[PDB]
Scaffold this active site. Structure first.
Site, PDB file in Angstrom:
ATOM      1  N   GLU A  35       1.182  -1.378   0.233  1.00 57.38           N
ATOM      2  CA  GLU A  35      -0.072  -0.004   0.009  1.00 57.38           C
ATOM      3  C   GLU A  35       0.933   0.999   0.303  1.00 57.38           C
ATOM      4  OE1 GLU A  35      -2.724   0.557  -0.715  1.00 57.38           O
ATOM      5  OE2 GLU A  35      -3.817  -1.342  -0.399  1.00 57.38           O
ATOM      6  N   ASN A  46      -7.545   9.927  -5.404  1.00 57.04           N
ATOM      7  CA  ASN A  46      -8.039   9.143  -6.131  1.00 57.04           C
ATOM      8  C   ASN A  46      -9.617   9.841  -6.583  1.00 57.04           C
ATOM      9  OD1 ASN A  46      -8.891   7.109  -3.192  1.00 57.04           O
ATOM     10  ND2 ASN A  46      -7.825   6.123  -4.368  1.00 57.04           N
ATOM     11  N   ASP A  48     -12.265   9.660  -7.526  1.00 47.94           N
ATOM     12  CA  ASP A  48     -13.648  10.413  -7.683  1.00 47.94           C
ATOM     13  C   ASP A  48     -13.136  12.001  -5.857  1.00 47.94           C
ATOM     14  OD1 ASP A  48     -11.875   8.899  -4.257  1.00 47.94           O
ATOM     15  OD2 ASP A  48     -14.065   8.101  -4.260  1.00 47.94           O
ATOM     16  N   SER A  50     -11.191  11.292  -3.216  1.00 42.30           N
ATOM     17  CA  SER A  50     -10.837  10.977  -2.063  1.00 42.30           C
ATOM     18  C   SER A  50      -9.478  10.721  -2.537  1.00 42.30           C
ATOM     19  CB  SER A  50     -11.779   9.787  -1.500  1.00 42.30           C
ATOM     20  OG  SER A  50     -10.998   8.704  -2.531  1.00 42.30           O
ATOM     21  N   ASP A  52      -5.829   8.405   0.133  1.00 46.02           N
ATOM     22  CA  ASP A  52      -5.621   7.974   0.761  1.00 46.02           C
ATOM     23  C   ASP A  52      -4.577   7.652   1.420  1.00 46.02           C
ATOM     24  OD1 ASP A  52      -7.419   5.744  -0.792  1.00 46.02           O
ATOM     25  OD2 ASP A  52      -5.924   4.902  -1.446  1.00 46.02           O
ATOM     26  N   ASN A  59      -8.960   5.386   2.893  1.00 44.86           N
ATOM     27  CA  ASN A  59      -9.408   6.448   1.946  1.00 44.86           C
ATOM     28  C   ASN A  59     -10.349   7.835   3.023  1.00 44.86           C
ATOM     29  OD1 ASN A  59     -12.101   6.824   0.365  1.00 44.86           O
ATOM     30  ND2 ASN A  59     -10.076   6.768  -0.542  1.00 44.86           N
TER      31      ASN A  59
END
Length: 129
Positions: A35, A46, A48, A50, A52, A59
């Site tokens: 990750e 991301n 959208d 968002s 991380d 998220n």
């Protein structure tokens, strides 16, 4: 902070993640490797909108507040910046909520794709735990 494989294994273990919800320590370390490459300061945005955050790439759509994800739920009740600290406590507490949510570690795409069904025990091999 960029953790060493065993150093992270030992902190996650101390934080009660080994076998948490039936997921052995090796799963947790594998997911962190993939990750964020073990870097607590890892961030990734991301499509959208968002983002991380942290070693487990939690998220901002659901788990934490970053002030810029409209419609964020903040289920872990914390600012996303808290997830970038050298102290992994908030990451851990929040991951425990995530994994308890229904889909287990499948919530972690890199885990599903890169860890799941592999010999995850390799990730804690040689570690003094």
């Amino acid at each position: 902070k960029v953790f060493g494989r065993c150093e992270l294994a030992a902190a996650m273990k101390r934080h009660g993640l080994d076998n948490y919800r039936g997921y052995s320590l090796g799963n947790w370390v594998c997911a962190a490797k993939f990750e964020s490459n073990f870097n607590t300061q890892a961030t990734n945005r991301n499509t959208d909108g968002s983002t991380d955050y942290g070693v487990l790439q939690i998220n901002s759509r659901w788990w934490c507040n970053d002030g810029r994800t409209p419609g964020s739920r903040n289920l872990c009740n914390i600012p996303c910046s808290a997830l970038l600290s050298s102290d992994i406590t908030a990451t851990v507490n929040c991951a425990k909520k995530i994994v308890s949510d229904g889909n287990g570690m499948n919530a972690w795409v890199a885990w599903r794709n890169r860890c799941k069904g592999t010999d995850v025990q390799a990730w804690i091999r040689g570690c003094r735990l």
